Structure formats: C-alpha cells, structure tokens
Amino acid sequence: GGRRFSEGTSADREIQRTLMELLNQMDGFDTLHRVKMIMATNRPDTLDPALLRPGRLDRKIHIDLPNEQARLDILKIHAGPITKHGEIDYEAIVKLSDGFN
Amino acid sequence: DVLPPEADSSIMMLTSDQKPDVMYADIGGMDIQKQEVREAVELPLTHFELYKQIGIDPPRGVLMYGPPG
Amino acid sequence: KPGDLVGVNKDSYLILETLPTEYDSRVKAMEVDERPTEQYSDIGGLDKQIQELVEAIVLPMNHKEKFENLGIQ
Amino acid sequence: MQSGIIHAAEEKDWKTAYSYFYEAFEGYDSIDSPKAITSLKYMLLCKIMLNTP
Amino acid sequence: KQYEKSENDLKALQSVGQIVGEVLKQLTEEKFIVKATNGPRYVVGCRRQL
Amino acid sequence: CTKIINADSEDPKYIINVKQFAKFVVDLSDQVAPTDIEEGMRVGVDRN
Numbered sequence A: 001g002g003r004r005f006s007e008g009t010s011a012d013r014e015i016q017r018t019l020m021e022l023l024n025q026m027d028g029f030d031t032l033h034r035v036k037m038i039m040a041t042n043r044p045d046t047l048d049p050a051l052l053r054p055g056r057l058d059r060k061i062h063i064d065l066p067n068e069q070a071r072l073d074i075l076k077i078h079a080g081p082i083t084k085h086g087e088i089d090y091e092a093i094v095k096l097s098d099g100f101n
Numbered sequence B: 001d002v003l004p005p006e007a008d009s010s011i012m013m014l015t016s017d018q019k020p021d022v023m024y025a026d027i028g029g030m031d032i033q034k035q036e037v038r039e040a041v042e043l044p045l046t047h048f049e050l051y052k053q054i055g056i057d058p059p060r061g062v063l064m065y066g067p068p069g
Numbered sequence C: 001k002p003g004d005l006v007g008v009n010k011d012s013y014l015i016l017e018t019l020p021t022e023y024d025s026r027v028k029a030m031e032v033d034e035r036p037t038e039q040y041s042d043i044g045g046l047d048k049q050i051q052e053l054v055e056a057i058v059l060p061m062n063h064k065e066k067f068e069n070l071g072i073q
Numbered sequence D: 001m002q003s004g005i006i007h008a009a010e011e012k013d014w015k016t017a018y019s020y021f022y023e024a025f026e027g028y029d030s031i032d033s034p035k036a037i038t039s040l041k042y043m044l045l046c047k048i049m050l051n052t053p
Numbered sequence E: 001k002q003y004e005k006s007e008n009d010l011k012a013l014q015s016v017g018q019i020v021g022e023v024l025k026q027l028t029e030e031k032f033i034v035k036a037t038n039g040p041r042y043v044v045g046c047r048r049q050l
Numbered sequence F: 001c002t003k004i005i006n007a008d009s010e011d012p013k014y015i016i017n018v019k020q021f022a023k024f025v026v027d028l029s030d031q032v033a034p035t036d037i038e039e040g041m042r043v044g045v046d047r048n
Helices: A010-026 A070-079 A090-096 B031-046 B049-054 C025-030 C047-062 C064-070 D002-010 D014-031 D034-050 E002-015
Strands: C005-007 C017-019 E021-025 E031-036 E042-045 F016-018 F022-024
Touching: A070 A090, B031 B049, C047 C064, D002 D014, D002 D034, D014 D034
Parallel strands: none
Antiparallel strands: C005 C017, E021 E031, E031 E042, F016 F022
C-alpha cells in the first residue's frame, strides 16, 4: 500500500508500514548512498506521496516503452540461439509490435 | 523492582532503530523558517523554566505544509 | 532435516526424538481425474481458444527434446 | 546585508553569512555608493574568520 | 563415542533448555529487555563470558 | 488425530492434538492399532 487517496482501504495501511520502514532506514537519516534502494513501479494506481517527496528520493527516471530502433535490436539477440537460416522478418515484427513492451 | 519508562518500546515504530544525524549547519536555506520551528520545538524540551518565568503556556506543536522536497 | 516432525522433551526444551514425515492422504484422492477422459468430444466450444491451448501445454510436453536442441524456451 | 551580519559574527555560520552578502553587493552597486563599499569588505570578513585564504 | 552422544542430553537437561528472543532494547549492559519469539517480553542478563 | 503417520519405535504413536493447541503422542493403556487411531478419530488421553 501507499496511496491512501482521500480514503483507501484499511488493508492498504496495514501492509504500507513494511515499505515505510525500509525506505527510511536507507536514506535521509544519513548522507550515505553505499546502501541504496531503487524502486520500480508498474501500476500507477497505488503510489505513495511519501516517496514522492524527496530525501527518500532525488530523481525520477522514466523507463520508456521500447523505441522504433530498440525493438529491432532485441529481436536480433533473441533469434540468435534458435536455429534459423537468417530472417529479414525482424522489420515486419516491429510494426505489428508497435507499443508491445 | 521497576524499569524506566524507556524500556519495552516497539521496534515496529520509527525512530528507535534510527535517529537523525542532521543539524541546522548541514542544510543551507530556509533560515527564517528554521528559527521558528526551533523556537517552538527545541526550547521547551531543553528548558521548561524560561517559558514559566514569562508566564505563557509552553509552545504548542507546529503544522508543516508547503512545496514538496 | 526440514519437514520432519520431531519430539521435544516436555520438562526441559531440547529436541529428544524424531517422528515420521507428515504427508496428506486428501491430496492423493484428489489426483488423477484423467479418467474418464474428456478429449475434445464432450468438451469444446470456442474453436480458437482450444487451439491455442493445445499449442501452449499439450504439444511441448510430447515434443520436449526439440526445445532443448533449438535452445529456445 | 543585515541577515548576513547577524549570521556571520554573532550566530557564527560563515556559509550562511556570505551567501546573503554576495546578493547585497550586486543590489547595492546600482543605486548606491557608500553602502556598496561596506558590503564588499563584509564578503571578505566572513571567510577571514573561517580562515581560508 | 556412544557415551558422549547420549551424555549430551544428560548435561543439557541440567543446563536447562533455552527460550530464545531477539534483543528489543539496549538500556544498560547488565539488563537488556528481550523479546520472546513466542511473544511475552522478559528481562535477561549479560554475563562477562561473552 | 489430524493425520496418521507416526509409529516411531513404539506401538503406534500418531500425532493427536489436544484443544490447548499442543501435539502429543499416544501409548497403550488398552491398545493402539492402525484402526484405533485414524485420520478423523478423536481419542481420550491422560493429562500426565
């Protein structure tokens, strides 16, 4: 849990405590970055105001949906272990896969 | 026998397996704001007597609202 | 070893003895509902869904050797 | 300039005093003459007490 | 060999078995308030053999 | 008895659970057999 909205469930808060304690321990009661945590989010719906506010943070880095060129290159490395004779198809697959992560 | 009131605290709770290490010198700005908070929180704890001599009720809590970060 | 039941002394707490591992009879009973077989002869509907499912589970279990050789998941 | 004098000698935080002084000089220089003179010496003063050349 | 292995039970019972905790708060080095894994909290000592 | 599996070097023990939420082992003061202690079977056992 994290985002308690105007009102959330009782349940969100009960679990929310486990995150709060870890976050704190690592940063802003200290100046160190030797012990660090990187947080990944995948659901926008529940995201803590506590984290947002710095000193449990300083940067927000968007990890984008793969690019126009980026999908082409993933396809080439993934194809390589599998037996093939060489395909030219990797360009066709990128179009169809427009917006696939 | 008796124990201190300190004993048998939760470790579930924050700030009894952490402590802050910061001070006023360590940050720069909001010097004006720092003096107000300090006046309200720090002085009555350290000194109960100063507030009594003057005759006012020791300082009440401070509500902190503002920009993120 | 883990999952092994043990005896602990009642009077002073030390691990005195060992006891058989616990299993569950209820799980064994639940198993193998493959008979009678269902096939695709009294179960069906939604022609496309059934085809994809045969591709995802059924064929890789028989055709297992090939996947290892090709190197592909 | 005032925020700076109180912070430099009295409260004794040199980083805090100096920073205000830098602004004070730049502001002072335009309209004023005697005031600006003072503020520049004061800039040097914080750092002399800190004892960095 | 046979002797030492059986005898280990004989001594442990005289030592008495152990109720286990994790240390809740360091107030002083003579008494520590300790928290049982089971639950009910206790005051324990520290001996100078460790 | 929640389940029958135990009979570890004595005439069948099983895990019988008293309603103080503690597990105990059984011995004979009548008999003990695969059929006397079963998966569902409740039992009368002594306090000490």
